[PDB]
Amino acid sequence: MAEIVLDHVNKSYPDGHTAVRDLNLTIADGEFLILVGPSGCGKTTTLNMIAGLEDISSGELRIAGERVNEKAPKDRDIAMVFQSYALYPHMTVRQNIAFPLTLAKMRKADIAQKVSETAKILDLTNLLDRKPSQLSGGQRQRVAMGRAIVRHPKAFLMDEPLSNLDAKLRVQMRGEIAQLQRRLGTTTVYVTHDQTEAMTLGDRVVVMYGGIAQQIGTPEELYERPANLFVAGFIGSPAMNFFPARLTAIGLTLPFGEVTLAPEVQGVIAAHPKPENVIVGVRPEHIQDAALIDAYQRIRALTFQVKVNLVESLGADKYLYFTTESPAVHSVQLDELAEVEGESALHENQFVARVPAESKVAIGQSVELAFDTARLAVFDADSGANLTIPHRA
Amino acid sequence: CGADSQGLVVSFYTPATDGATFTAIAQRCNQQFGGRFTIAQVSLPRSPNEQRLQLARRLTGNDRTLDVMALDVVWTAEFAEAGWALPLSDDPAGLAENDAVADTLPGPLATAGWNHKLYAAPVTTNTQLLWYRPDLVNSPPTDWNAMIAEAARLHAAGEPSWIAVQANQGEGLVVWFNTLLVSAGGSVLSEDGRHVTLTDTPAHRAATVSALQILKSVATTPGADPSITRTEEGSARLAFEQGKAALEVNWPFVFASMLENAVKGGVPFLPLNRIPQLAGSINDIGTFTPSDEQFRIAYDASQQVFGFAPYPAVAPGQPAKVTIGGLNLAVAKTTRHRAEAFEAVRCLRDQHNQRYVSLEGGLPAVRASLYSDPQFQAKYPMHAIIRQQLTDAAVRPATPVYQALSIRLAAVLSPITEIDPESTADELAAQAQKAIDGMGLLP
Amino acid sequence: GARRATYWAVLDTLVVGYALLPVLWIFSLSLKPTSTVKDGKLIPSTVTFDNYRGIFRGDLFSSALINSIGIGLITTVIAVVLGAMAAYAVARLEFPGKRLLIGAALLITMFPSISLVTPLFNIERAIGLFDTWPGLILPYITFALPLAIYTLSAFFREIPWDLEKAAKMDGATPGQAFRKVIVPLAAPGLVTAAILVFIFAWNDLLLALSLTATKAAITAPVAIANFTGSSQFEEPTGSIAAGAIVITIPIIVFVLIFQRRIVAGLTSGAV
């Protein structure tokens, strides 16, 4: 309902673990802003600092200028959904929903009226009199959301409420959450770990890492312009194919020929501090078989030949890992992004290409492909930011 | 080690109130035996009403280790009928039935024979005296009303004003009530226990009412002991020796306690520690044991902050009739060494161990000869008063159901402060009748 | 950091005081010399170990601590042995009457011990085991074995039984599984039920007081209940206090040693 102001709020421990360092951001009214980031990068820390369940190290959080650093969570008029469903087994679902209304000392008749309304919004009419044991995981999640909505708080604080269910239920309830929020038009601070969730719903996405919000922008904006290399490797599914090269006055020295760049992008990459090596990134949907594309694309595309070692029918498209002539990418910040999964660089020199399943090139058969050159993701040697964007101020 | 085999060990069961003296007695007796066997003392609880409980539990549970028991002076008429405490008549040596009556006093001996047959040998006797602080009071009361008058007088002067009597729900209260009742010309049961003779005769009713009125007038008086209804022998003796009381009624064993506890420190109004002539005059185990003149020193010193006098009467005309008490030695029925036990009994009570217990444990001996010795008369100054009080003493009913009657009495007199004479006197009769008929269930 | 720290400090020092005052009191009594023992000074003055000296001089407490310890061990051994063979059968099998069995094992644990002393006395006086170790071990199982069944049945239900099928799928000999995989998964439960039953053995006074006579079978709570002081004429308060301290320190240090297992056992699984 009301914008949420941040005044250099940080989370640091006297035991040494600093969770947040002086973040400042205002959550617009009604926007479906979503927090995304790796595990323990400060997401839950920020969320519980908002909810007052976590003590703020320093800084000031304001709900449109209201002193809430010392405010009790019961006196902030907020609501939230816990991924553990935070359900009371002893009381029925009707009593579950009515509980915060009961605490509100409202009229029991209008309390039951509001419960009936919000349940019919969620179609839980025959479940309100049941026990959580008598319900399904989706039903329990719906119960949690209904318990969170009836309060009409200043803001919603959701915490991956669909993380622990089936994928189809996940996506359909995700659409339903989008619909419910937009109909209700209230501020919601959604916290999660997957990027696709935000990409399908977020009116704006904020990537979090170790107390640093690397970027504040819209899902399409994060998709088109990775503000750095960490967001490039983290946002997108799968990540864009990474290629190493060194600086060139007309482009980059690609392992498959010389890549030329436009004058404007050449100027902007020159405007950045000159790196010794450049990190090139291209998304698998860009790299396509040249045997099916027109020559009008190839005037700017650098065509080359490549053999494949991984073949599969992945439906309409084929994510095709190929034995390519491209060495491993090296950068001072790429190391901290490498050990995330464990089998890192074992399939290096073999990158993936999202191509339609119509082609029948199998393993051993070298197929000549081509992709646009301007679709590269450029990164500095020390900053790793997208050098197609000038260094801000 | 591993297997410590030895001869017979006759087990001797004496109350804990006088354990350390009968232990030394057993030590002295384990010399006149050589290697035939030894005696081992074992302690019973300090209260009379539970000493019987322990003994009866052991006797009925066939505890084959119980050999010799020192039982109270009111239990023979019960242990004899119940089969326990086998009679003197069947000592395989044939010596107890005439060793018991050799030199015993005529009073205590009458408490052993039940149906003219002896079942135990008297080892000691008792009778209460009046102990006072002669520096505070002068000319001790010699009457209960005078006792209370002196108590009030001392309380008005802000002095120790407790009377320090035994008033718990045990047997020490029934003993006191019986003393008062009989000294007022009454009696609980008939001469033979057949029907309660407490409140049938108007004279008897007047006597029991006077006794109840004295009991109530004490324990409800200015400056009385607050916890008067929880006191017994040890508590009264200690509360006197601390200095909280200036009068007390207690058995003669309090004199040895006075002297020993004063020499060992304790008693503040009688230091007896700053006298180097008393150095080393405490045995390595605790007992006093003066040499021959350390006693004279520590006794002439105490003779001016301590003193005794005969029991206070009820009416100023007639004297009192103090209730007799003591211990008898008997041989349990659950004994396999039924000869060594009868030997150790007669070896426990003789003209040296009696002298020892009376001169270092306060317990009045029972050998009528000792009270005519000059030296024994010089180390046991209350001998004359004890002899006098034992002449016209007032024995207890001595019926098989006695200890079931004393429980009812103590139960209906349990809170002394909550006594009113006229109803409590008429209420005692129903309980005595029930105890005679063995009806209901005791508390 | 600022509020909560001092809040919890001053809140949980209250419970320390609560728990330690009735013990520090008697311990201070136990050190006062026999003269000043009658003043209400909570903190003593010119303490003396004479009371403990008089307690050690003697053999009444050794020959009772030994009886208590031995009876505790001999009781808990057979209790755990006969109770594990039931708890395992009650947590894994479905015989007709299970709920009745567990309800009985729950109820009989807190049996009214007065309903036993009359027939037990009337029996043991007539069979021969009046004052003996078995004469005490036999009634004590009425409280040991139900407690052992209850505790071990609570603990066994926390065993990942699927490991049985696991071993059946990568090995052989269901007996070898029962021997090698669940036995290490069931040793700590026995080690903890033993401590619980042993500790529970000590807190009995009625039966050990009404079925024991002499030094051969008197336990510790009975030994201290009948104590009256070292000497016969001195004030008995300090001596009784010292005797109590000496008779109670062993089980106290035992409980302090095994605190973790104890709290993990009583709170079945939790903590």
Binding site: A51 | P226 | I108, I114, T118, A220, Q259
Partner: protein
């Protein structure tokens, strides 16, 4: 199926057999003795009476006084123990600086001998030497009056048997996930409506089981009464009654009827707690 059947019928065979032989046999023996004029002093002459041993108890007075004292002690002590044990389990569960220390402190009274504690409380209320007795108005001596002595007994009982109940309650408490407490706090739990609205109705089975233990254990109170007062002055529980009428009166024929009646009444208590209130075993 038959395999596990005949396996259980052989594993719970020795346990059940020993339990029967050592519990149901003395109870039947007591019931059969409860019909005779069996006296310890006169063993050879015992006659089958009938019901002449329950008449003389139900019509007596010391029976009802002891029963009433036992019920009052049980109710009051159990209520106070429940309150203190809950307030203590909370501290033992949510403390922050030292938890091992508070756990050790709580266990100290749990493992102590139940008689040395009674000696401590006995010497604390003795005038002159008792630091508690020296606080009352002078010349109080509360160990002689009936009701103050009962109060002292209740205090000792509470102090001794709180830790056990607090651990029993912390058992059912540690299964309350903290996320529920946080959700309540967010929704507006006053930190009291929290307790009375989510925590208590969630740990009801553990509460009822702890209540059953404490009731059946305080109904057999023998030790604190035996040490502090000894049962004199009408402050004697129903156990003191049997222990006295068996060893001081030697009457087995009714010292056993007392045991039978005590068994029947604790069975009634158990029936109440089981049928009503549930009180099911933790195994479900």
């Amino acid at each position: 199926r038959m395999a596990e059947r005949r396996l259980a019928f052989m594993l719970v065979a020795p346990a059940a057999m020993l339990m029967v032989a050592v519990t149901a046999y003395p109870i039947g023996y007591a019931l059969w003795l409860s019909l005779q004029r069996n006296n310890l002093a006169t063993p050879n002459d015992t006659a089958f009476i009938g019901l002449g041993n329950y008449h003389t108890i139900l019509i007596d007075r010391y029976w009802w006084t002891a029963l009433a004292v036992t019920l009052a002690i049980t109710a009051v002590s159990v209520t106070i123990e429940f309150v203190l044990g809950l307030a203590l389990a909370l501290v033992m569960h949510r403390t922050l600086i030292g938890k091992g220390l508070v756990r050790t402190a709580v266990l100290i009274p749990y493992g102590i001998v139940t008689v040395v504690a009674s000696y401590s409380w006995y010497y604390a209320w003795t005038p002159g030497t008792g630091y508690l007795a020296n606080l009352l108005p002078y010349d109080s001596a509360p160990l002689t009056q009936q009701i103050p002595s009962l109060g002292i007994v209740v205090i000792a009982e509470v102090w001794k048997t709180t830790p056990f109940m607090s651990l029993l309650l912390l058992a059912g408490l540690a299964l309350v996930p903290e996320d529920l407490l946080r959700a309540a706090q967010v929704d507006g739990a006053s930190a009291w409506r929290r307790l009375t609205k989510v925590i208590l109705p969630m740990i009801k089975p553990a509460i009822v089981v702890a209540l059953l233990f404490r009731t059946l254990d305080a109904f057999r109170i023998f030790d604190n009464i035996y040490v502090l007062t000894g049962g004199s002055n009408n402050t004697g529980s129903v156990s003191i009654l049997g222990y006295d009428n068996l060893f001081k009166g030697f009457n087995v024929g009714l010292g056993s009827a007392i045991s039978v009646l005590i068994f029947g009444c604790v069975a009634v208590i158990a029936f109440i707690f089981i049928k009503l209130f549930g009180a099911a075993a933790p195994g479900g």
